[PDB]
Amino acid sequence: DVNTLTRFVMEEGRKARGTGELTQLLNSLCTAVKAISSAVRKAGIAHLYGIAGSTNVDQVKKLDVLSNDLVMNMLKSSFATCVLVSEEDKHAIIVEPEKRGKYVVCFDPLDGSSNIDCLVSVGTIFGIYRKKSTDEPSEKDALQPGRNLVAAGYALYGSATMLVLAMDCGVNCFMLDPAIGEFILVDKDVKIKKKGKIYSLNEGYAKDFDPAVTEYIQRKKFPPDNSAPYGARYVGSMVADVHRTLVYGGIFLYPANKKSPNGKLRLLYECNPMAYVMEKAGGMATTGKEAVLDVIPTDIHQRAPVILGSPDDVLEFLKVYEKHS
Amino acid sequence: DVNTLTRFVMEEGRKARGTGELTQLLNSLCTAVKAISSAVRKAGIAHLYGIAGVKKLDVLSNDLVMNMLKSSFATCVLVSEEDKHAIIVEPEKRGKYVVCFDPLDGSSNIDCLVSVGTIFGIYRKKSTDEPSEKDALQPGRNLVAAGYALYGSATMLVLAMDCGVNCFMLDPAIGEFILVDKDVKIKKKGKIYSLNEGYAKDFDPAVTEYIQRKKFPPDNSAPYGARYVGSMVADVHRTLVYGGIFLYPANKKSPNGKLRLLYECNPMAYVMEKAGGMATTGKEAVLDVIPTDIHQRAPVILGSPDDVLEFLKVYEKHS
Amino acid sequence: DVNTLTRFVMEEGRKARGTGELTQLLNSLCTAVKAISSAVRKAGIAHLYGIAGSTVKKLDVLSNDLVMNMLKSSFATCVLVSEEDKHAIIVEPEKRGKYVVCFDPLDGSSNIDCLVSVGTIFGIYRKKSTDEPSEKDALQPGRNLVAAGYALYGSATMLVLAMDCGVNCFMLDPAIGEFILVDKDVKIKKKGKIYSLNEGYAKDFDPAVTEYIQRKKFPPDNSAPYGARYVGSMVADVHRTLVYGGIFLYPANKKSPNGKLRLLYECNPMAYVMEKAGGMATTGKEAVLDVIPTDIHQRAPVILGSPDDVLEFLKVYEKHS
Amino acid sequence: DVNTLTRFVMEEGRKARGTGELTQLLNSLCTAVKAISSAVRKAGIAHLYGIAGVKKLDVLSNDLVMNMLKSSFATCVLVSEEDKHAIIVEPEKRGKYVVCFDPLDGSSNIDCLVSVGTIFGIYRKKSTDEPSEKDALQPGRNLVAAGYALYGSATMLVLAMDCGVNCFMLDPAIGEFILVDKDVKIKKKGKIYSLNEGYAKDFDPAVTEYIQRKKFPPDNSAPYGARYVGSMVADVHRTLVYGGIFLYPANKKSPNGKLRLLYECNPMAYVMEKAGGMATTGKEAVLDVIPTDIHQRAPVILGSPDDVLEFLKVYEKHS
Ligand SMILES: *CC(=O)NCCc1ccc(S(=O)(=O)NC(=O)Nc2cccc(Br)c2)cc1
Ligand SMILES: *CC(=O)NCCc1ccc(S(=O)(=O)NC(=O)Nc2cccc(Br)c2)cc1
Ligand SMILES: *CC(=O)NCCc1ccc(S(=O)(=O)NC(=O)Nc2cccc(Br)c2)cc1
Ligand SMILES: CC(=O)NCCc1ccc(S(=O)(=O)NC(=O)Nc2cccc(Br)c2)cc1
Ligand SMILES: [Mg+2]
Ligand SMILES: [Mg+2]
Ligand SMILES: [Mg+2]
């Protein structure tokens, strides 16, 4: 039987006898994802370039901004949210009381900034929490560890557009059919391969690597047990590198260095959702000192080192990292 | 004022007083590329999954290019990564151009959904005899045109001819390639280096040393950023757009390289050179290699002129 | 704020505290409609004409397959009646839900070649009998409808959805594959200035129809004559009547003495949209929604549209009986 | 063998040894039609409705045809239904063609989502005088090309030249017009009549009687069916594919009809005659009327030859 995102989550929520708020939230997010995807593929660009004589110029917003406006407005209008956090805004957004719902959403609306003009894959990252404080909604309601996530996932705008959705029961992948604006379930209950043959990180920072990271990269290029060396792949858009990690197995790293001794990626709307997806797919995601989902944040925009992927590959890193204490 | 690929090639062709054949070829090619793009973006994937109750992409893409070029009446010999021998166009559909192409580069890659693309090179048939596979065996310097479609976050067609390089963005709302970057010239020096560092075990000493200079620069300029998508069209297009260098060098475990000269290296070398960049094997300009096999491999180092010269300077050292 | 049909229906179902079966059905139907729309607009026809080399299914058949399969897999239906199928389709026990659905999947395939508007009409009933599901479950009068409407594949693709609360109009934005709410709680004009019917049957008309048409062309009260429009595709003609007002007629004639259009999946849904939007829909003898069907493909006369216009016709009809 | 409009028109032009200007005009025109089609199908309408937190469609359509034709370098005078005066292309862009068009016909009824259409007629400029509105005052006999795009269930482009009539279906997945019917001919006698019978009180006695013969055939044959969409493109296209007759004749409020000669009646009369049909005002063939005003009106009765002839017989009976 064919299944669409909207239908599949509708049925799953019926089973759980939930209130239908999470389902509304997801549906609204999917609409935003379809609009962002249409914009990323440059629908209408000919009007930007004067096909009508440059009387017709949204449309003129940059994709960062449009993407953020779409997720914001769509989540606001889902009636399912009360506090929203984006890489685009300094302070958490507090939803109009008439629109307030029970969920808290942290999201990167368009990950892949140094990378749109070259046309590499970009994505949307999201993580969804429930409001736990009894207080008025405020920035504090977004300061929860990744372990409190009810749902996280991402949309990858690559050669095709895919939405990966993780909840505590597992991870599902939905391919967008652009001919009908529907997310087709193509892979239920995904699990990451136990050990992969790809390592992923920016090696240009080699001069700033911790010696534990320097050694782990060495072990993949010159295996001590004379096993075959891993292959290297680094897209530089975190949504693409993590998805490849999910689908082919292996390891992805943005560890701590000099330009960022706490890593570069943000905990609430980059690191936590990829950790949540990975753990629920049978993978790992560590800062080196702990599980990413256990870091209790104090700033919605705080960074964190992240090392994730196939569990055997992350354990191996963890061994090399203990050895350097 | 707005322009489209087909309009632009049509006026540039009329200005040069040619026969229209190359314009026909490229328009047929454009149609194939838009149909490949549609399949890569997975239009109609819901029917494959039983929404109403059979080829993989690379076979489909080869058929799209093969057929669109045969019926253009502009070609005589067509070489594809997908076919062991050259396809000779049947006599009634024969034109004077030879096309070598990769219909869909990116294979360890479709299933993880990162950028794929079509690469192509167009040679004019010199000889007056019956077309054969020999006619595709020309150096890249004889290229009349070359380029690539990148099915990235959006679909872009890059077209290099003798005059220069132009970039056309596909607007899927109307299915037109829109001219967005005219007479593109690559940065003289870039800040990104691109290669699979998993082969460090097998690198020739010069690569090992040149890479080290990117990580620990001998003039205390900042290290280069590293980027490697694993899809040559994506890596080469980023190189053209932001500058820097792309390397698929001869390791000692395939001393001729991995990428294919006629339909991966030569087109990318042509695009680089016509945009003021370079592309070398280490021993000569990629475009100067004389081929003996339509499927032969070459090592490739291309990108910004100062970056390629720098790798070459290291390369001469190691002799 | 912006609203989509998926969000709107979902939010309305939550307030109403229903079980979600209707919402599920409506989500499946919307998905099938987007796929019919894509095929009707001929996306991919290059492949039919050999773009990939020397080389599937009529639009009629594919459209029916799309509605059939999406409704079956919604788990919300038990009996499905289609213009395309001689017999009512009985849903497999393991995918059976509460709802009976009667539909024309592609209304107007005698108009596909000339490329004019086609459409999908649908009416949704709660299964009423407790018997094993069968054709009889589709024989309810239109009064019993819980939801009805159509999709118009015209210059753009619209979906009109009627429930007991009223009529809403959704525009398909094909860039995102989302049905966007553009008209909330629409109501037909009290009186229109257009009349719509195939006047080529004039030789076979009843004297009532004959007199009513004359009043439109030569108004005894010397006011301006009505304009005439007739696409010959019911979804297009009914939709114009909704948005612009007036009257649409497909009466019986001597050659088709029970009428031409079909009661279960053309007249009843259109009558339901019309009544829920403040209009009327009659056979002349009774309200269309009050006819008790006996056969799933039976035909009915219909005269529908702006209330003043239908009442006028009925005044002409009563004079002649 | 598959064919697209651009390839087909281009190959035909090679064979006729033309300058290529007409090919370029038509390609420009095709691109405008794909852009009008996208807008008519409401692509992007969600953004107008607040999805991210209002030029009339036919004004945007006019801008698209205007701008693509100006920048084609094939035109010099543009006459649109949307514009009071002829538009004069700027000197540096002037080509040799005059184009008369309705950018979005039936578009005062876009609200009912009925079919809309684009109608066009392409003339060769006849004098060397500074371009002016007088260059559009040619009789339809002088047409080099004419046709229309129908924005209906699908988008179709119908293109009439001297050789005949071809129908191209737009595949929106790839933005190509595919040749689906070559050298179309209207059938000799039809069974549909099309006109607004709301005008019955003001009809010419010949129109009253002719239509009465459609409903009550004196040879006791089967009556015709009636259809009237109210968008000329849809009514004429159905007349073309199914045969029959379409009427917007003269009467009271209109001794010269309501439809306009240059960009409604002439292109449709040209399409009809190239398909073997007819198109009359009653007194003269539509294509022979010499216009004096770019917006002047003409009565029109067109379609299958047997049917138009039968109308003219009733018409002469009342003359
Ligand atoms: C991993 C997994 O499958 N989790 C369950 C998915 C799920 C759970 C709960 C919801 S909900 O609370 O937002 N929606 C819900 O309960 N909807 C509903 C649907 C149909 C009928 C009814 Br009465 C209620 C969503 C998804
Ligand atoms: C015109 C009008 O407003 N009619 C009422 C609309 C309506 C729509 C759907 C239903 S239902 O039977 O399908 N119930 C339903 O969807 N419930 C529900 C509950 C909790 C979560 C969800 Br996502 C859905 C009833 C009435
Ligand atoms: C009726 C029919 O069969 N074909 C239309 C004939 C036609 C079309 C276009 C032109 S042109 O004026 O634009 N000239 C042209 O296309 N020239 C051309 C094209 C390609 C190669 C060459 Br060498 C020349 C004329 C006639
Ligand atoms: C680099 C640059 O800036 N320009 C060269 C581009 C180019 C493209 C096509 C051709 S060509 O060989 O194909 N020449 C024609 O096509 N001429 C033509 C003739 C009649 C009608 C039409 Br329509 C076109 C030559 C050069
Ligand atoms: Mg980011
Ligand atoms: Mg290859
Ligand atoms: Mg029907």
From TrEMBL, chain A:
Beta-D-fructose 1,6-bisphosphate binds at D111, G112, S113, N202, Y205, R233, Y234, M238, Y254, K264, R266. SUPFAM superfamilies: Carbohydrate phosphatase. GO terms for molecular function: fructose 1,6-bisphosphate 1-phosphatase activity; metal ion binding; nucleotide binding. Its EC number is 3.1.3.11. Mg(2+) 2 binds at E87, D108, D111, E270. Residues 4-187 form the Fructose-1-6-bisphosphatase class I N-terminal domain. Pfam families: FBPase, FBPase_C. Residues 192-321 form the Fructose-1-6-bisphosphatase class 1 C-terminal domain. Its cofactor is Mg(2+). Keywords: Acetylation, Allosteric enzyme, Carbohydrate metabolism, Gluconeogenesis, Hydrolase, Magnesium, Metal-binding, Nucleotide-binding, Phosphoprotein. It catalyses: beta-D-fructose 1,6-bisphosphate + H2O = beta-D-fructose 6-phosphate + phosphate. Mg(2+) 1 binds at E87, D108, L110. AMP binds at V9, T19, G20, E21, L22, T23, K102, Y103. The keyword Oxidoreductase does not apply. Transmembrane segments: none annotated. Pathway: Carbohydrate biosynthesis; gluconeogenesis. GO terms for biological process: gluconeogenesis. Belongs to the FBPase class 1 family. Homotetramer. Catalyzes the hydrolysis of fructose 1,6-bisphosphate to fructose 6-phosphate in the presence of divalent cations, acting as a rate-limiting enzyme in gluconeogenesis. Plays a role in regulating glucose sensing and insulin secretion of pancreatic beta-cells. Appears to modulate glycerol gluconeogenesis in liver. Important regulator of appetite and adiposity; increased expression of the protein in liver after nutrient excess increases circulating satiety hormones and reduces appetite-stimulating neuropeptides and thus seems to provide a feedback mechanism to limit weight gain. This is Fructose-1,6-bisphosphatase 1. The lineage of its organism: Eukaryota, Metazoa, Chordata, Craniata, Vertebrata.
UniProtKB/TrEMBL annotation, chain C:
It holds the Pfam family FBPase_C. Residues 4-183 form the Fructose-1-6-bisphosphatase class I N-terminal domain. The keyword Phosphoprotein applies. Its EC number is 3.1.3.11. One of its GO terms (biological process) is gluconeogenesis. GO terms for molecular function: fructose 1,6-bisphosphate 1-phosphatase activity; metal ion binding; nucleotide binding. Belongs to the FBPase class 1 family. This is Fructose-1,6-bisphosphatase 1. It comes from Homo sapiens (Human). The gene is FBP1.
